[PDB]
Write a protein that holds these residues in place. Structure first.
Motif, mmCIF file in Angstrom:
data_model
loop_
_atom_site.group_PDB
_atom_site.id
_atom_site.type_symbol
_atom_site.label_atom_id
_atom_site.label_comp_id
_atom_site.label_asym_id
_atom_site.label_seq_id
_atom_site.Cartn_x
_atom_site.Cartn_y
_atom_site.Cartn_z
ATOM 1 N N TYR A 35 0.819 -1.211 0.000
ATOM 2 C CA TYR A 35 0.000 0.000 0.000
ATOM 3 C C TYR A 35 0.859 1.271 0.000
ATOM 4 N N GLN A 37 -0.372 4.226 -1.886
ATOM 5 C CA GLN A 37 -1.210 5.290 -2.426
ATOM 6 C C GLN A 37 -1.102 6.554 -1.580
ATOM 7 N N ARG A 58 0.241 -7.745 -5.515
ATOM 8 C CA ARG A 58 -0.641 -6.583 -5.714
ATOM 9 C C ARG A 58 0.000 -5.268 -5.287
ATOM 10 N N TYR A 60 -0.773 -1.038 -4.956
ATOM 11 C CA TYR A 60 -1.663 0.109 -5.017
ATOM 12 C C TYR A 60 -0.826 1.373 -4.981
ATOM 13 N N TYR A 62 -2.112 4.540 -6.455
ATOM 14 C CA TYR A 62 -2.893 5.672 -6.918
ATOM 15 C C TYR A 62 -2.598 6.933 -6.112
ATOM 16 N N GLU A 79 -1.615 -7.483 -10.066
ATOM 17 C CA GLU A 79 -2.504 -6.309 -10.010
ATOM 18 C C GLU A 79 -1.718 -5.027 -9.850
ATOM 19 N N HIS A 81 -2.391 -0.704 -9.713
ATOM 20 C CA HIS A 81 -3.295 0.443 -9.674
ATOM 21 C C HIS A 81 -2.495 1.720 -9.816
ATOM 22 N N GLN A 83 -3.938 4.737 -11.055
ATOM 23 C CA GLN A 83 -4.845 5.845 -11.269
ATOM 24 C C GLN A 83 -4.477 7.068 -10.452
ATOM 25 N N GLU A 103 -3.787 -7.529 -14.528
ATOM 26 C CA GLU A 103 -4.853 -6.560 -14.282
ATOM 27 C C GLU A 103 -4.294 -5.141 -14.155
ATOM 28 N N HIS A 105 -5.040 -0.856 -14.125
ATOM 29 C CA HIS A 105 -5.931 0.287 -13.983
ATOM 30 C C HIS A 105 -5.178 1.592 -14.209
ATOM 31 N N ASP A 107 -7.031 4.664 -14.660
ATOM 32 C CA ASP A 107 -8.031 5.699 -14.541
ATOM 33 C C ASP A 107 -7.333 6.990 -14.119
ATOM 34 N N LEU A 129 -7.178 -7.474 -17.913
ATOM 35 C CA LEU A 129 -8.029 -6.336 -17.590
ATOM 36 C C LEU A 129 -7.305 -5.064 -17.974
ATOM 37 N N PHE A 131 -7.977 -0.691 -17.832
ATOM 38 C CA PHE A 131 -8.803 0.461 -17.487
ATOM 39 C C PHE A 131 -8.220 1.769 -17.971
ATOM 40 N N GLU A 150 -11.289 -7.410 -20.582
ATOM 41 C CA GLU A 150 -12.107 -6.200 -20.469
ATOM 42 C C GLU A 150 -11.328 -4.972 -20.941
ATOM 43 N N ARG B 91 -12.879 4.425 -4.880
ATOM 44 C CA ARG B 91 -11.521 4.956 -4.731
ATOM 45 C C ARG B 91 -11.434 6.217 -3.870
ATOM 46 N N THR B 119 -7.672 -1.428 1.547
ATOM 47 C CA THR B 119 -6.547 -1.113 2.418
ATOM 48 C C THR B 119 -6.859 -1.640 3.813
#
Ligand SMILES: *[C@@H]1O[C@H](CO)[C@@H](O)[C@H](O)[C@H]1NC(C)=O
Ligand SMILES: [Ca+2]
Lengths: 321, 247
Positions: A35, A37, A58, A60, A62, A79, A81, A83, A103, A105, A107, A129, A131, A150, B91, B119
């Motif tokens: 984590y 973000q 994974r 994250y 963003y 995964e 992320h 965004q 996957e 993303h 965005d 995936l 996005f 997708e 989000r 999270t």
């Protein structure tokens, strides 16, 4: 085994929300999920040693300062992320550092039409995936992986679509194109035709002035066309879409329907037709008969006369002449 | 009117088996109506609420209407309160106030320092990072802050002004919670199995408990308390069921 600033708990490393401009170097090798973000992290704050976390699956990231696509990521990330970031260039090099990506993303980024290096995806063969919600795409990339299942391109400025952009994506199942600037001339001939496994087609909130033809009916279940300015429906638009069980056409400028276009919609279940300027002439009489012959199973909405005024607001299946 | 301190939770009804494993459902406990609102969970695709006219028409799958939400929803933490829906925008740590009658968002509020987007979700995940709850005291927000180390943190939230009116730090980890709900300002933490923790906000005091909670199926998606008929509205692995409460 964790840095001082962040807090780690059974594979889950929490470094999020800590004003991080740079990623900590002292990291647990048994890492699983990250984590990061809501930090100030840009591309230079990525250590080279980060690559060796072979158990991270994974990430994250963003809302950071990634001003382009990140390198030195754990080789086996599935995964990602990215965004709410400032991403622009996307190189083959960048994606090839994570071919085992599944996957993705993107965005809320600033990625445009040519911003992707041509053939970047030729290596990520696990990518399923994708996005691209809220980017700066003016068209659709050609070198997309067949493994894509997708594709979200909602809220871009998409106006034109070439055929071999989407051809080769037989693994494609859902295709989302909200808020784009698409007209019928901006459409490819048989650009949707080759998507054999296509399930959903969402083309909400564009500028279409007619129903698209040459749609794949092999697996299409749901077809979305709301918030458009459609006048006509070509007699072959819904041909062979026999698995189509959902179709929405609310907020259009549709007055009349050509005879016998829904003959092929055998498995239809839900037909929503709200906010349309229906004129009830001799051209509209075929509908009334068709409505009465319909099994009670199928639901239809928004099918009421606005014209003539004499029968305005009245349900179409109830009228004599 | 406080029903009392919770002594036990037991299954009562089994409405049907849905085709989605996760999701949530409840009523407007402040409206004298048989209206049921229904939201199945699909990650990154959830932006709708379907309204039903009665319990029998709900089981028949006979909807009154459908509400298209201005934002996506993160998790099964939605809540309906006095003709207005509240949910978590995807989000973000933002709760969206959504007036059902006029069909407009009438406001929004940020839930300070909340961890979000898997999270600190629940055990089962699904962006359960934020769960809303209704009880005799008003509207609440259950989440986890990174300061409170992913452990459950509850705040009382004004449903009309969307201001945070007080905060309590608990000791139970939100990743551990299978779900949660509020009664009389008392927190009820589910593990799945058991309610194995409670927090009494009036006293700003917590206590470890041991009240049975039906493991009927494994995937407990959502648990929402109702002060009107004093029931639990639970979604457990594709199944739409009710739980009765023992006081
Ligand atoms: C569609 O999906 C199936 C999944 O079983 C896959 O085997 C197939 O290759 C895909 N494409 C076509 C054209 O069937
Ligand atoms: Ca709950």
């Amino acid at each position: 085994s964790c840095p001082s600033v962040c807090r780690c708990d059974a594979g889950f490393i929490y470094c999020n929300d800590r004003f991080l401009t740079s990623i900590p170097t002292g990291i647990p090798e048994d890492a699983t999920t990250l984590y990061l973000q809501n930090n100030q992290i840009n591309n230079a704050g990525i250590p080279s040693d980060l690559k060796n976390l072979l158990k991270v699956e994974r990430i994250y990231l963003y809302h950071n300062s990634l001003d382009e696509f990140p390198t030195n990521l754990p080789k086996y990330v599935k995964e990602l992320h990215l965004q709410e970031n400032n991403i622009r260039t996307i190189t083959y090099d960048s994606l090839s550092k994570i071919p085992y990506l599944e996957e993705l993303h993107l965005d809320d980024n600033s990625v445009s039409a040519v911003s992707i290096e041509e053939g970047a995806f030729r290596d990520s063969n696990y990518l399923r995936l994708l996005f691209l919600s809220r980017n700066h795409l003016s068209t659709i990339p050609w070198g997309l992986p067949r493994t894509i299942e997708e594709l979200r391109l909602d809220d871009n400025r998409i106006s034109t679509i070439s055929s071999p952009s989407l051809q080769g994506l037989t693994s494609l199942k859902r295709l989302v194109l909200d808020g784009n600037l698409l007209n019928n001339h901006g459409l490819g001939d048989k650009v949707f035709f080759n998507l054999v496994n296509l399930t959903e087609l969402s083309l909400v909130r564009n500028s279409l002035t007619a129903a698209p033809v040459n749609l794949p009916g092999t697996n299409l279940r749901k077809l979305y066309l709301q918030d458009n300015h459609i006048n006509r429906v070509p007699p072959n638009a819904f041909s062979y879409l026999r698995q189509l069980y959902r179709l929405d056409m609310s907020n259009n400028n549709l007055s009349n329907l050509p005879q016998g276009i829904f003959d092929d919609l055998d498995n239809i279940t839900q037909l929503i037709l709200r906010n349309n300027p229906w004129y009830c002439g001799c051209k509209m009489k075929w509908v009334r008969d068709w409505l009465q012959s319909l099994p009670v199973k199928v639901n239809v909405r928004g099918l009421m006369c606005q014209a003539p005024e004499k029968v305005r607001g009245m349900a179409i299946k109830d009228l004599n002449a | 009117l406080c029903p009392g301190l919770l002594k036990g939770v037991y299954q009562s009804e089994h409405l049907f088996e849905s085709d989605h494993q996760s999701g949530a459902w409840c009523k407007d406990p402040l409206q004298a109506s048989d209206k049921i609102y229904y939201m199945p969970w699909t990650p990154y695709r959830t932006d709708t609420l379907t309204e039903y006219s009665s319990k029998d028409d709900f089981i028949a799958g006979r909807p009154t209407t459908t509400y298209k939400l201005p934002h996506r929803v993160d998790g099964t933490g939605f809540v309906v309160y006095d003709g207005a829906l509240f949910f978590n925008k995807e989000r973000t740590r933002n709760i969206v106030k959504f007036d059902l009658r006029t069909r407009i968002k009438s406001g929004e509020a940020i839930i300070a320092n909340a961890n979000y987007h898997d999270t600190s979700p629940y055990r089962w995940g699904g962006k359960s990072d934020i769960d809303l709850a209704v009880d005799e005291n008003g509207l609440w927000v259950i989440y986890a802050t990174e300061q409170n180390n992913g452990k459950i943190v509850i705040s009382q939230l004004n449903p009309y002004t969307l201001r945070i009116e007080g905060t309590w730090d608990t000791a139970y980890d939100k990743r551990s919670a299978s779900n949660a709900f509020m009664i009389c300002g008392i927190l009820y933490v589910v593990k799945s199995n058991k309610i194995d923790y409670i927090y009494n906000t009036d006293q700003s005091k917590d206590s470890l408990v041991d009240v049975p909670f039906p493991n009927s199926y494994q995937y407990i998606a959502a648990v929402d308390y109702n002060p009107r008929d004093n029931l639990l509205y639970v979604w457990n692995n594709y199944h739409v069921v009710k739980y009765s409460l023992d006081f």
